[PDB]
């Protein structure tokens, strides 16, 4: 049959960054036609693979990764990128072999008084792996003394939340973002 | 086949934390809608959050917003709720269980409802 | 913040019909799903979608929804149907799962 394209791109709501979702694909036939003719995408770059070139190669499994970040940070999710998304929430292989599919979702995930529904991690002691994450919410120790769990001066909570209000610049505005990866 | 275990429960001082964790096994976990519903003793049935099949935050309780924070894993096929600033009135046993029907479904389908719950597991906030 | 309410007690003779209320605006526009809770046990689901039934549940349950008022209609009430029944409905406003105040079905006689 098909791949279930449409749940993941389509789906009703995104999860966060530092929660970013993963969908395993396999055992379908791609139909990547109705991608790459799309013109609702803003950002679309593929590394390694040509975008039409895609429905004459076969590969083992497809991952799909999505999560909403801010506009300004889309342009993070590319090989050999540093910042607080890259860093500390999803991180690409500098030999990545994929695309990158972002939106404007200014639309769906922004709220007049303010979403709860989208964070991301701001303090982590060291840098993500290629394809890791890290949901845990321990309280991050940035002084002398610990913290056991309590926060307080030098003992902040690790996630952040966006906040997107309509009113916000498109560099603030929510993007849905979907990697596509191939192996 | 079907069953929800939850754990992280006890005993918590008022203003700390606490993370639950509820274990999916017997089905496909990253295709239904997951959700906390706690009920302090005696008390009727409140909803906590949510998260959809794709991990998806999907609103709070107005006395929890802000302070709980719902993730899932559906490589572990768990599911979790970091609970921050407890107060007493949090003092109640918190649920585990699963939603078929569309929305934060995989697909567009209905509403089916909470299918399966799990046994709970007890938080007091006591000093 | 939408808010269901339905009526804390009801009470039923053996072998007759309960009907259990669920207010609310415009709920009819919703689906409204029904849980049972026996005393210290798990809350199950009974009725969902309006008026669908899961299996294993006998079909003297059913359940209305019309205009502004969902019903939970049960029939040939026996004795182990004394238990908690609450209503639930989605509230795309607000985006938060709603649950109502509970009703505790006492099986007279």
């Known amino acids: 049959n098909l791949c279930p394209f449409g749940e993941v791109f389509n789906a009703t709501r995104f999860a966060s960054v530092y929660a970013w979702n993963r969908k395993r694909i396999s055992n379908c036939v791609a139909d990547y036609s109705v991608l790459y003719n799309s013109a609702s995408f803003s950002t679309f770059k593929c590394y390694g693979v040509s975008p039409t070139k895609l429905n004459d190669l076969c590969f083992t499994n497809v991952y799909a990764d999505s999560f909403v970040i801010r506009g300004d940070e889309v342009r993070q999710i590319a090989p050999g990128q540093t910042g607080k998304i890259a860093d500390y929430n999803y991180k690409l292989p500098d030999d990545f072999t994929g695309c990158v599919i972002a939106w404007n979702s200014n639309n769906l995930d922004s709220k007049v008084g303010g979403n709860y529904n989208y964070l991301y991690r701001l303090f982590r002691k060291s840098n993500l792996k290629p394809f890791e994450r890290d949901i845990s919410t321990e309280i991050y120790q940035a002084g002398s003394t610990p913290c056991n769990g309590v926060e307080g001066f030098n003992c902040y909570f690790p996630l952040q939340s966006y906040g997107f209000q309509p009113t916000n610049g498109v560099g603030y505005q929510p993007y849905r973002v979907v990697v596509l990866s191939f192996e | 086949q079907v069953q929800l275990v939850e754990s992280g429960g006890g005993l918590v001082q008022p203003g700390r934390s606490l993370r639950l964790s509820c274990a999916a096994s017997?089905?496909?976990?990253?295709?239904?809608?997951m959700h906390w519903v706690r009920q302090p003793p005696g008390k009727g049935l409140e909803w906590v959050s949510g998260?959809?099949?794709?991990?998806?935050?999907?609103g709070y309780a107005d006395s929890v917003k802000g302070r709980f924070i719902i993730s899932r894993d559906n490589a572990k096929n768990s599911l979790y709720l970091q609970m921050n600033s407890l107060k007493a009135e949090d003092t109640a046993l918190y649920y585990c269980?699963?939603?078929?029907?569309?929305?934060?479904?995989?697909?567009?389908?209905?509403?089916?409802?909470?299918?399966?719950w799990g046994q709970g597991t007890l938080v007091t906030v006591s000093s | 913040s939408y808010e269901l309410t339905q009526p804390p007690s009801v009470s039923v003779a053996p072998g007759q019909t309960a009907r259990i209320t669920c207010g609310g605006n415009?709920?009819?526009?919703?689906?409204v799903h029904w849980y049972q809770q026996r005393p210290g046990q798990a809350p199950v689901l009974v009725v969902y979608?309006?008026?669908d039934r899961p299996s294993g549940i006998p079909e003297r349950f059913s359940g209305s929804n019309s205009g502004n008022t969902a019903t939970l209609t049960i029939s040939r009430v026996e004795a182990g149907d004394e238990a908690d029944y609450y209503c639930?409905?989605?509230?795309?406003?607000?985006?938060?799962?709603?649950f109502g105040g509970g009703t505790k079905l006492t099986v007279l006689g």
């Open positions: 639930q409905v989605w509230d795309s406003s607000s985006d938060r799962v709603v």
């Open positions: 269980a699963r939603e078929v029907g569309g929305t934060f479904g995989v697909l567009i389908s209905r509403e089916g409802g909470l299918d399966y």
């Open positions: 998260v959809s099949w794709n991990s998806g935050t999907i």
């Open positions: 415009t709920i009819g526009s919703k689906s």
């Open positions: 979608d309006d008026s």
């Open positions: 017997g089905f496909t976990f990253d295709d239904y809608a």
